[PDB]
């Protein structure tokens, strides 16, 4: 799907916990893990709206207490074609 679920965390450890919970708790595809600088790490997953909604809920809960904690947990049901350029196509 095109729905984008994004979780931002302070440090890599909560991000990997969030990504693990998100991909284990729904049928989402992990597309990117982008370091933002300032300690912020962001894990981006794509999938159907229902799947992304369940993943971000599972991700936010899993990594809220991990390490420094959570920054953001956001869901975009449909992503404009323009934003697709700034999003990572495949994880690295």
């Amino acid at each position: 799907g095109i729905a984008l679920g994004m979780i931002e965390t302070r440090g890599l450890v909560p991000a990997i916990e969030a990504a693990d919970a998100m991909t284990k708790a729904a049928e989402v595809r992990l597309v990117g893990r982008q370091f933002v600088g300032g300690g912020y790490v962001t894990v981006l997953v794509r999938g159907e709206t229902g799947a992304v909604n369940a993943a971000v809920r599972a991700g936010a809960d899993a990594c809220e207490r991990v390490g420094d904690g959570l920054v953001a947990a956001h869901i975009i049901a449909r992503v404009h074609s323009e934003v697709e350029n700034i999003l990572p196509k495949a994880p690295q």
Partner: protein, 134 residues
Amino acid sequence: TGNDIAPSGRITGPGMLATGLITGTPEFRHAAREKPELVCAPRSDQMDRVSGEGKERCHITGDDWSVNKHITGTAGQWASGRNPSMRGNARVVETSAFANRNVPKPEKPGSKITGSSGNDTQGSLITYSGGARG
């Protein structure tokens, strides 16, 4: 007398475990040896002994199957005392859905999710994998 094998504290081993929680042991077998305003009375205040088509809340005058005190007969002493009985002391602990309507429960899950969520905090507690509020 003789080769006593009763549990003792001097001799360590399995025999000393679970003292007091065990029954049927030689030690416990031994211990045991030793003008009304309305025709029908108020629905709320009165409860009927036999509820359906046998209720005495309504004062049905004239001939009726009610038997007064002076008339002895089938019910009461003549049915209660036919068979001997013994009422015991039991721990009546209800483990059921209704009994667990009030149980100590963990803190309610909270959702910090933003965006196109369609979440409603008002609704009954929906949960999602992990116990996260849905």
